[PDB]
Amino acid sequence: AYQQSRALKKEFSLPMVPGMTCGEEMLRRSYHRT
Amino acid sequence: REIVCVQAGQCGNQIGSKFWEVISDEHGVDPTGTYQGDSDLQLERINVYFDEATGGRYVPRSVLIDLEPGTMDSVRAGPYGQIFRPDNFIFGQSGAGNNWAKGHYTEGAELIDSVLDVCCKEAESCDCLQGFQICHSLGGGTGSGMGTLLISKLREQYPDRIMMTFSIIPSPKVSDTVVEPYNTTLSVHQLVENSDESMCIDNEALYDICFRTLKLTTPTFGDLNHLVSAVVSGVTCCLRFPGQLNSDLRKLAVNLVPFPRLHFFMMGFAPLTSRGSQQYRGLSVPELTQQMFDAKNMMQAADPRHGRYLTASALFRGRMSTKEVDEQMLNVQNKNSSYFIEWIPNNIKSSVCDIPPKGLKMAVTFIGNNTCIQEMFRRVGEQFTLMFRRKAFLHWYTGEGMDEMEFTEAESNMNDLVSEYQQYQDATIE
Amino acid sequence: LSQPVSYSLLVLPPKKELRKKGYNMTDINTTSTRVHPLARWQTHVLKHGATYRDALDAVEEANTKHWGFLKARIQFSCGSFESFVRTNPNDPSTLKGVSTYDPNGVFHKETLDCTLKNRSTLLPRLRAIVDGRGHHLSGSTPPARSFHPQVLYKNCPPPVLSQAGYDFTPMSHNAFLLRTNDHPQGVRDVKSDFMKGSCDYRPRAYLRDEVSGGVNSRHCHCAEVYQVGDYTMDLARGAEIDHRNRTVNFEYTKKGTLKSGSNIVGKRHARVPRF
Amino acid sequence: REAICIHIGQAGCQVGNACWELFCLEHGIQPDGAMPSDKTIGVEDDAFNTFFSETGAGKHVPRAVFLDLEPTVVDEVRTGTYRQLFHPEQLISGKEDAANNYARGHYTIGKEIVDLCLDRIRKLADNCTGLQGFLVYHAVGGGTGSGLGALLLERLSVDYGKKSKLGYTVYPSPQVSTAVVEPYNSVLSTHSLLEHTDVAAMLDNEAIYDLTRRNLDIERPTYTNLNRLIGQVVSSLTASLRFDGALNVDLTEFQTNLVPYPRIHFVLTSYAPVISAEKAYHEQLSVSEISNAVFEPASMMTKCDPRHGKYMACCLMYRGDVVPKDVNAAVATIKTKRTIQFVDWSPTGFKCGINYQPPTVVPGGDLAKVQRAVCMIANSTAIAEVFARIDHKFDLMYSKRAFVHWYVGEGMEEGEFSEAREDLAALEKDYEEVGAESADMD
Amino acid sequence: REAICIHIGQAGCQVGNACWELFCLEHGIQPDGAMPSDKTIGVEDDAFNTFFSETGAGKHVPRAVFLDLEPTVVDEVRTGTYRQLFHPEQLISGKEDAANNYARGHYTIGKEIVDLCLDRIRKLADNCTGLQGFLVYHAVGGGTGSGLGALLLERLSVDYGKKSKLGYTVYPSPQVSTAVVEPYNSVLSTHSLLEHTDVAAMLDNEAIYDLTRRNLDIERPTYTNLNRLIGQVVSSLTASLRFDGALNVDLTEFQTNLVPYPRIHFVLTSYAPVISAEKAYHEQLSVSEISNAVFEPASMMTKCDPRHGKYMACCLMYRGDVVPKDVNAAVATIKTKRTIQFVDWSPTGFKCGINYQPPTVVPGGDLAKVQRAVCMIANSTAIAEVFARIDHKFDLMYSKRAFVHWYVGEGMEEGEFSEAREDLAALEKDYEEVGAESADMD
Ligand SMILES: Nc1nc2c(ncn2[C@@H]2O[C@H](COP(=O)(O)OP(=O)(O)OP(=O)(O)O)[C@@H](O)[C@H]2O)c(=O)[nH]1
Ligand SMILES: Nc1nc2c(ncn2[C@@H]2O[C@H](COP(=O)(O)OP(=O)(O)OP(=O)(O)O)[C@@H](O)[C@H]2O)c(=O)[nH]1
Ligand SMILES: Nc1nc2c(ncn2[C@@H]2O[C@H](COP(=O)(O)OP(=O)(O)O)[C@@H](O)[C@H]2O)c(=O)[nH]1
Ligand SMILES: [Mg+2]
Ligand SMILES: [Mg+2]
Numbered sequence A: 001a002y003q004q005s006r007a008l009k010k011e012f013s014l015p016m017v018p019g020m021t022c023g024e025e026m027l028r029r030s031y032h033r034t
Numbered sequence B: 001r002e003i004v005c006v007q008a009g010q011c012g013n014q015i016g017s018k019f020w021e022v023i024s025d026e027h028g029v030d031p032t033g034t035y036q037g038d039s040d041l042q043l044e045r046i047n048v049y050f051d052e053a054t055g056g057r058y059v060p061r062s063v064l065i066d067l068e069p070g071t072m073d074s075v076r077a078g079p080y081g082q083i084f085r086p087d088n089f090i091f092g093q094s095g096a097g098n099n100w101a102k103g104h105y106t107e108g109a110e111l112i113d114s115v116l117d118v119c120c121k122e123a124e125s126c127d128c129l130q131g132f133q134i135c136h137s138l139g140g141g142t143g144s145g146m147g148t149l150l151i152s153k154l155r156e157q158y159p160d161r162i163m164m165t166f167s168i169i170p171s172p173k174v175s176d177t178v179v180e181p182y183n184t185t186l187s188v189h190q191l192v193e194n195s196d197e198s199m200c201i202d203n204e205a206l207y208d209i210c211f212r213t214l215k216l217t218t219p220t221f222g223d224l225n226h227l228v229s230a231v232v233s234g235v236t237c238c239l240r241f242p243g244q245l246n247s248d249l250r251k252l253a254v255n256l257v258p259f260p261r262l263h264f265f266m267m268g269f270a271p272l273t274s275r276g277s278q279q280y281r282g283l284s285v286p287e288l289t290q291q292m293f294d295a296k297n298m299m300q301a302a303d304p305r306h307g308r309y310l311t312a313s314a315l316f317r318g319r320m321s322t323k324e325v326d327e328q329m330l331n332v333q334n335k336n337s338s339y340f341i342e343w344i345p346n347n348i349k350s351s352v353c354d355i356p357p358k359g360l361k362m363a364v365t366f367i368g369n370n371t372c373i374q375e376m377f378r379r380v381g382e383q384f385t386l387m388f389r390r391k392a393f394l395h396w397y398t399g400e401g402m403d404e405m406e407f408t409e410a411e412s413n414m415n416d417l418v419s420e421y422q423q424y425q426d427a428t429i430e
Numbered sequence C: 001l002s003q004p005v006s007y008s009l010l011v012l013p014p015k016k017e018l019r020k021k022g023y024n025m026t027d028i029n030t031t032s033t034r035v036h037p038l039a040r041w042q043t044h045v046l047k048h049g050a051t052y053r054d055a056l057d058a059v060e061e062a063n064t065k066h067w068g069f070l071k072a073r074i075q076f077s078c079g080s081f082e083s084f085v086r087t088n089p090n091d092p093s094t095l096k097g098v099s100t101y102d103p104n105g106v107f108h109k110e111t112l113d114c115t116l117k118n119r120s121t122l123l124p125r126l127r128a129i130v131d132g133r134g135h136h137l138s139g140s141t142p143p144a145r146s147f148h149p150q151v152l153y154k155n156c157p158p159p160v161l162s163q164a165g166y167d168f169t170p171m172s173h174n175a176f177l178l179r180t181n182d183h184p185q186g187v188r189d190v191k192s193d194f195m196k197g198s199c200d201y202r203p204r205a206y207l208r209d210e211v212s213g214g215v216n217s218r219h220c221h222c223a224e225v226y227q228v229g230d231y232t233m234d235l236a237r238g239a240e241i242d243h244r245n246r247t248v249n250f251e252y253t254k255k256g257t258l259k260s261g262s263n264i265v266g267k268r269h270a271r272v273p274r275f
Numbered sequence D, E: 001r002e003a004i005c006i007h008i009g010q011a012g013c014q015v016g017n018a019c020w021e022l023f024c025l026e027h028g029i030q031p032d033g034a035m036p037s038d039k040t041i042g043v044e045d046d047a048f049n050t051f052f053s054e055t056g057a058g059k060h061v062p063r064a065v066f067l068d069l070e071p072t073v074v075d076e077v078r079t080g081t082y083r084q085l086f087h088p089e090q091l092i093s094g095k096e097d098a099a100n101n102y103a104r105g106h107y108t109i110g111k112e113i114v115d116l117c118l119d120r121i122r123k124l125a126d127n128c129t130g131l132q133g134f135l136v137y138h139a140v141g142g143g144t145g146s147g148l149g150a151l152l153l154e155r156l157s158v159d160y161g162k163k164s165k166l167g168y169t170v171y172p173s174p175q176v177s178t179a180v181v182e183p184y185n186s187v188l189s190t191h192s193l194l195e196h197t198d199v200a201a202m203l204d205n206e207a208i209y210d211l212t213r214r215n216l217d218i219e220r221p222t223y224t225n226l227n228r229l230i231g232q233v234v235s236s237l238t239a240s241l242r243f244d245g246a247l248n249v250d251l252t253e254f255q256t257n258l259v260p261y262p263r264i265h266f267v268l269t270s271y272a273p274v275i276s277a278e279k280a281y282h283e284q285l286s287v288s289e290i291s292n293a294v295f296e297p298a299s300m301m302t303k304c305d306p307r308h309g310k311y312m313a314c315c316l317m318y319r320g321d322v323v324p325k326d327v328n329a330a331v332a333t334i335k336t337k338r339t340i341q342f343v344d345w346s347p348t349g350f351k352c353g354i355n356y357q358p359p360t361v362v363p364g365g366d367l368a369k370v371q372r373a374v375c376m377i378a379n380s381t382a383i384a385e386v387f388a389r390i391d392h393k394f395d396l397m398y399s400k401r402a403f404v405h406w407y408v409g410e411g412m413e414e415g416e417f418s419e420a421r422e423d424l425a426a427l428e429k430d431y432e433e434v435g436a437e438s439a440d441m442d
């Protein structure tokens, strides 16, 4: 589902600045406790 | 020498949108904000109205306030809307209802702190701050209430600067709003204490300008707001371009106001030429002067023939001789000597600026201080007394919380202003 | 209590070292508070349990044991200390305490009156008024019990129950009444999303008694006036509010708590029709 | 931005069908609630939001409730063409009617049904961020429309407070009549309506029948024609919220400009280019002609003649290709007329509005297609004559207590008749007093 | 991490079947105890550990006991579809029922069976390393559920001590009823339950019938629907142990936050998006809408109205795609309402939890599929009315000694009736007194 978003994220390689990327936790697949 | 603009209410936001279109055109600023102009004369004073954002861009020093965002959504959707800073739009969640007390007391106190924060942020960014400029109507609700509220707060915070207003006033023939006399009287009461100089415009005069002088077949509010934006951008022209006789807003105020209550002025702009007659009249300083004094070209309903000029000012743009300006002002003062107050030896100030507006060889804007303005206030006071004696719509204002004593103060102050004008009209040397 | 566990000493090097360095120790006496450039600070800790007299014994033992003792201080666990110095140098057995210092001396002295004034009102509040099970403390009983209609519904409309929509015991519904637009004292206008404020939705009974005719019909009982128990509740005659829908006055009891306000007006002396 | 519509009883639901048909066709929502996928405009417009909300899958659903005591009409809506558009909770139906008894609606049955309605309206009001009023459609001639409409407006007025409530109301026609007991229900409704409504617009079927006979070429009109005219009026008044224009008018502006004193809130309504397609090609339709049209009494939707009174305020809404200068010239010419008189305490008599969106054309409709239209609502003392005639009818019957036992059996004190009749008498005296010139009283 | 479930009598076993169906389908254990691990996750998983244990051959077996005095329902479980899932020792059944007598269960028959139950629970608790409470399912209206549930909770409370015990309890509904002697058994149960439970959640079948008619579109519901709703609630509360999340909530947090005084441990429960597929597709279901839903009394699974009392504490569990800012905005909106009241001694009224795993959909189920849900348990003084009506029915029967000879014959002193009735009277006075404002007490 979220493949092309990850592709763009890997291509761009933006730095870690507050307010740049948000909501990456909501895109996970499993959420099971490992 | 930087000006800060405030646009309030529907009329104010629309006129502001047209003003910033005109200003961006004169300085060659693309609607993306990039400078694309063709002379250094444009760049060297761009700071006066624009702040510089990074890698090229310019942003306009204006605050937009309204109680419902509908007009703002229209201006943001317009062709130049992108230029405006998003943080500069301040809005509530319910309208003013054309009610002065609501606009001043209930949503006013709710929003006003965010407006003062934006206005202070904008003012303190200037390296040297010149006066404020405000556009609003006096007959409306948020225009009247929030304009006078903000003016009072800015006069508390910046008492040494200039306060300038452009204001729309109710036509003598047809009302646009039923409760206009109350809102007008209370707003004029606020202005005469707080303001330094106020210009008044009747929409009826702009309609007659368009139909008789420009002979437009299908005029729209864009044309009226373009005429207003033209004069507004013209008054400040000497602030921001070189010239043979520089002038400044404070110099206009110092030459126009003889006594501190007498600060209400008539406005006009001269080079309006009819849609099919340009072949019949060449541009010249006499032609501009002739249009300049024709009452057809004045944007208020009162006529000079029932009063006398205390003072007047003319600002000329273009390459022209100073001799022609001085001798024209002498000839007009000498030939019409009965219409000029005799205990002042010269009523007209002139100023000359080198750079005309694009596509015009020459232009002048005219500001006049005339006692015939007393007739408008008398009419408004009559209509107020008719409504107030019968409590015609008073329960809205009293239910919001207003003391009735406020209405009697505003009526008394306006009546004294009319009396003072009448006394200075009939004064004599003896 | 002040439990002292620390002590520090300020000592000069041995006399041989002073002679080698080139300092005349005979001029160690001075009338100023500055110290000799060769003096150094060394500190030791006491045991996990000790007394003030133990610290004095350690200080005096240090005074006897080494030459060049200039001064010493005993540091308490509250942050204060007391300084020890010989009256006449080059003459031991004259040690005494000259003064004491704590970091909160002027700090506490400046703020004493406001502290006492606030404490005198704080202490009556902290007294418990209920027992372990939350019952009455043998006094100050309320005039009426909690579940009575006029006590439970002092300032709130009672429920209305109807059989519509239920094939069993009916249940009430929630309303859209908003409380007064009251903000916390001094907390900035902090907000997480666009919310429906209480500046709007002002009740229509704000000034109906002086800018209108008041109540003209008997329909006030359908939505505004309720009969609760042996009393009458009117939603238009409650706590006073201003034009922006915020309360005007606050009433406090003798103990200092905040009153709630009552919409109950009158007592209805109901009698069964009998003759 | 948002407005919530409340439809009550038979007339209100049937007028609702025409209204929501029109708002769908004007915005472009399909009957199943999905925008067409063939269009590639590229832009993602939101103007519908005033009347529709989106779930997120892109279905549209409307901000309305339908309230009735008999099932048949709501079940017809449930089984009709717009079945999939409405959420089933919005369509509320009782078991049995209020049988032309105001008392049955107000005391016995509507008191049971009203809490479901209030819960649905609350659920609507929670899904808003700039609610700016309630629109209510009902008739005061029938039992459930009068009794439950009054009770529900009363509860709304306590719960929501200052928020505005605008009513569209069908009053009993001066010689067309449908039930014997109409005067009692209309008087008792009107007693509640004085306190609990901000503006009330009055309609009479006899006027819309006359207008459809004279202007349109319809020999045998029926209620669907009247309901389409009403829908056009509502669309004209709410267009100011939804489309670009020169002079917008918020719903709060009506109460401020039209109501001088808190009881004087009943206004007359009329609409100008009601014209047939065959007439439309013989005539131009300029601004000044339709402005002259709105003032003829043949144009009114209530059977009253404004020449028998004095105007206090007028509100003129123009939509379409109009320029302000023509509106100003027209209004000044109207002001010149000798059969139009304003009370001397109201010198500035007019409010104007100008919107650019022209009126929409409905595939089955009977109005011609026109580039511009104007709609007026106005407050005038002539209105006192309608109440006076409803009073004589009430007095003639009440002199013999002709039907009162029904009302008393269904829960009403006999005293309530006399109270309401005295309040309407005082309203008549109010209209006499407000219209007296100040120059006469010195 | 681990929790042990104890199911008692008929309601508790039938609710257990739905619970274990759900926990199997959510974790992925086959009905024969296996896990077809097909994911390419690289490392193993542990979420099952709370409810299942592995032998080593990879079969799963669950941490539960089923206790009954009649064989039929447990033999039905033994012969059903899940035969191979449960260990046969876990399914314990006696020969004959407690015949709606609490005294028969407590004194005569449960006393024989109780030691087997404790030996099984001990054998489970020895195969744990972080047990953090017991979940108990029973009905207080019947004989074995009341008598053996009380006796077993007493023994557990002595043997295990401090470990928490959270009860989900089906109380006798206020006018639907199934047996005559329900008040006596419910009073005596509540007397034993007061000392030996940490939080008690109350359920009424009449409320879940109303909820399934009103929210779902089921004309003829049966116990499987109610049991599936209960299973969803328990899964929502225990999800915080089992899946990753922003703000976890351990089972010990409930007792600390919900119980102000040691007798005041009875809580109300509600669940928000109980919705049918057609309604679910007519509406968006945002955080604020479901937060508004959990406070309506129409959403509750116990027949009490919280508008007749004051809230003392609320615990809100959000699961699924929710963001904390929306939770804060919702709770602040709830706090704004005037018809929602908290006792003035409880200013900080709320506890929040936020978990990322959305609720599972069961193939035969009647609930829609939804991206988010919220579940609430709350303590309110309105609960005093449930005891008052049970006590009134007890007083009516005991005033005439209506059935006492059965209870005295099966082993109980008559004195126990008066003791229990006086304890419930004191509980009523506690709920009356705690609700008294502080400003009145000075
Ligand atoms: N214009 C118009 N008038 C209508 C319509 N339907 C009914 N009326 C009129 O309204 C009056 C009847 O009111 P109803 O709506 O039938 O009354 P009700 O709300 O159903 O009240 P109950 O009979 O008790 O159920 C009569 O004067 C009808 O002529 C309609 O669709 N359009
Ligand atoms: N919700 C729900 N209620 C149930 C269920 N089974 C029984 N009840 C209700 O619980 C009460 C009966 O309690 P039972 O569980 O039958 O009593 P018992 O535990 O079997 O006690 P004995 O009869 O002595 O064996 C009645 O109110 C039933 O309506 C169920 O599966 N689900
Ligand atoms: N010249 C001009 N006048 C306007 C414009 N918009 C409104 N007006 C006039 O201003 C008055 C209405 O005031 P308004 O702006 O609506 O007040 P507000 O409701 O407080 O914003 C009327 O006299 C209108 O004719 C405009 O764009 N240009
Ligand atoms: Mg009907
Ligand atoms: Mg059984």
Ligand SMILES: [Zn+2]
Binding pocket: C219, C222, D106, D151, D154
């Ligand atoms: Zn009523």
